[PDB]
Amino acid sequence: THFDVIVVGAGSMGMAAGYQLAKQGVKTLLVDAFDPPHTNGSHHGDTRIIRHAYGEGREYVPLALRSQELWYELEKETHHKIFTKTGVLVFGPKGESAFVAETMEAAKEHSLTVDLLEGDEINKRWPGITVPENYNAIFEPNSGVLFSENCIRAYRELAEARGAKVLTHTRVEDFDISPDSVKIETANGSYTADKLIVSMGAWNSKLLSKLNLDIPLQPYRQVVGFFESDESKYSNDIDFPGFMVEVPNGIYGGFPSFGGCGLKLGYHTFGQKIDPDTINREFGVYPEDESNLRAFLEEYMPGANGELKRGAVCMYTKTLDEHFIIDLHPEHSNVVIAAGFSGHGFKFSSGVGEVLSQLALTGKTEHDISIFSINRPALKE
Ligand SMILES: *Cc1cc2c(cc1C)nc1c(=O)[nH]c(=O)nc-1n2C[C@H](O)[C@H](O)[C@H](O)COP(=O)(O)OP(=O)(O)OC[C@H]1O[C@@H](n2cnc3c(N)ncnc32)[C@H](O)[C@@H]1O
Ligand SMILES: [Cl-]
């Protein structure tokens, strides 16, 4: 059967696209190597931060705000839990974090609601945080935490109810693009459509070559740990925030304990360079997995440094400039690419689903996606 649209990779981006297409009666096939949500890609480990005031760049702010509204819409549409409004705390040494400074500029440029705090004020407001007096902070009360696996699961169920088809456990191996149609090849059969969306996560770094693209995309092994914590300090129930922070040796992101699961932490600016088909997905096989996390906790969040309850191993896919790629294929207007989310895309996946649907159906989008151009110089070595 010939589809209107085929999505290859039904993960964060692809499943959101599938939902957007299905809701409009577009006949859509999604193909995934596994059965999303799953633990082999970039979307597991339960939780993801969404921030609006954006330390990676003030220009992501409208897409973040649109995505936030889309997440509230999803919360209303499903029985799965989507979002909890933890707020997000950003801190770092005063005058020595570009990330903090840009987050502050973004909030002023877009009139976001934030609180500015420094030093002992941070430690006083949130028992359990111990920063030096020379640190400053910006706290965003209305952003928070997404349950990422639930997001994908909900978009899947909703899309499928509207007639989208999802072909699981099926790896796309090659492509054949014509001026007026697209074709995918798999071990389970070949499929055709009018339009293609390519959203294969870390595997974009191996298979975009089949579409005659040569773009630096490096996959990285990124672990997270959940730690037994003082629940009187670090529980969501006592308003402990989500956080993304810069310290002299890099950026860390974390989450309050939800229902006693433990504070969750990840070291964002370091990971191992890997291949997605040979990555070691067992937490704790390198001593850095646990040690890098406790190095942060014992300094800054000392009551959240108990027994390791749970670990996970996830992948980032970085571009050279760490900005996304969201665009048409330069040689094929019937092919849409979503790649290179550089460890910070999940929060936008709802909005990206909308962009991808518009690009597929119309070749354009109402969103400003200029900074994510596939033709930009900074993508290339
Ligand atoms: C790993 C990670 C990422 C992350 C994060 C912490 C960790 C440890 N923290 C984040 C945060 O707090 N907030 C945020 O906004 N983002 C954060 N991230 C990044 C984010 O999770 C990623 O940027 C995002 O998930 C990327 O999504 P994308 O849709 O690109 O990737 P995916 O969900 O893995 O989906 C890809 C799918 O493609 C399928 N696949 C692969 N190969 C094939 C083939 N050949 N054929 C068909 N399907 C294929 C995969 O199976 C997967 O489902
Ligand atoms: Cl990523």
- The answer to whether the annotation marks 339 as part of a ligand binding site is no
At residue 358, the 3 state secondary structure works out as helix
CA separation for the pair 14, 11 (Å, rounded): 5
43 and 147 Cβ atoms separated by less than 8 Å: no
Domains and CATH numbers, the chain: 3-43+149-213+321-379 (3.50.50.60), 88-141+219-318 (3.30.9.10)
For strands 88-93 and 242-247, give the pairing: parallel
Which tokens go with 331?
Answer: 């040689």
Q: How many CA atoms lie within 13 A of 377 on its CB side?
A: 0
Burial class (CB in 10 A: 0-12, 13-18, 19+), 110: middle
CA separation for the pair 72, 259 (Å, rounded): 22
DSSP per-residue string spanning 226-293: EE---HHHHBGGGTPPEEEEEETTEEEEEE-BSTT--EEEEESS--EE--TTT----TTSSTHHHHHH
Best mutation site among 6, 7, 8, 12 for ligand 1 pocket (most ligand atoms within 8 Å of CB):
12
| Residue 268 is among the residues annotated as catalytic for this protein | yes
Give the experimental resolution in Å: 1.5
| Residue 151 is among the residues annotated as catalytic for this protein | no
CA of 341 to the centre of ligand 2 (A): 4
CA separation for the pair 28, 14 (Å, rounded): 11
Which tokens go with 316?
Answer: 């980032």
